[PDB]
Amino acid sequence: SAGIVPYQVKAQLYLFPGPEAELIRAAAEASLRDYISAQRRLGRDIRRSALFATLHVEGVQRVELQEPAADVVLDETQAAYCTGYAITLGG
Amino acid sequence: SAGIVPYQVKAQLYLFPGPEAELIRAAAEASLRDYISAQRRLGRDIRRSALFATLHVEGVQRVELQEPAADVVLDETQAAYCTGYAITLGG
């Protein structure tokens, strides 16, 4: 099999309309980048449920998560690598 | 007129191998009860993404959320009511 498993995170955040909206999105992105780094360091699977939790910073009413469409499960010889992310407002 | 829209929360928690499973489960349930009361008081929609975030307390690796199977979206005259919950351990 391939040794590196690629994944992307594509999500839309739905917020209440207000001036903090762009900031909340940046907070969600920072939280995500922290998650990406942590999972890389700990070599863990990428779970949709954890990504929802990661993106649900304060002010986020719902998260629509397009990618990854399914969990990223690694076999014993694989490592996961995030090939990019796109966190936008729904909203 | 508009009534009350019922929902239940059925989920299984998959935890990281380590401490006592039951304390983590109680914390997730406690977090859930807070979410239920908060949404009822604010009359907001019930979103699966928010429930994932709610159940992802420390120690939780993955959340399987059976119910509610879909988001509970209310019109301007409706209210949501949780008719019960079941938070169990996966493995």
UniProtKB/TrEMBL annotation, chains A, B:
Transmembrane segments: none annotated. This is Probable bacteriophage protein. Residues 7-83 form the Baseplate J-like C-terminal domain. It comes from the Bacteria. The chain holds residues 202 to 292 of 295 of the full protein. It comes from Pseudomonas aeruginosa (strain ATCC 15692 / DSM 22644 / CIP 104116 / JCM 14847 / LMG 12228 / 1C / PRS 101 / PAO1).
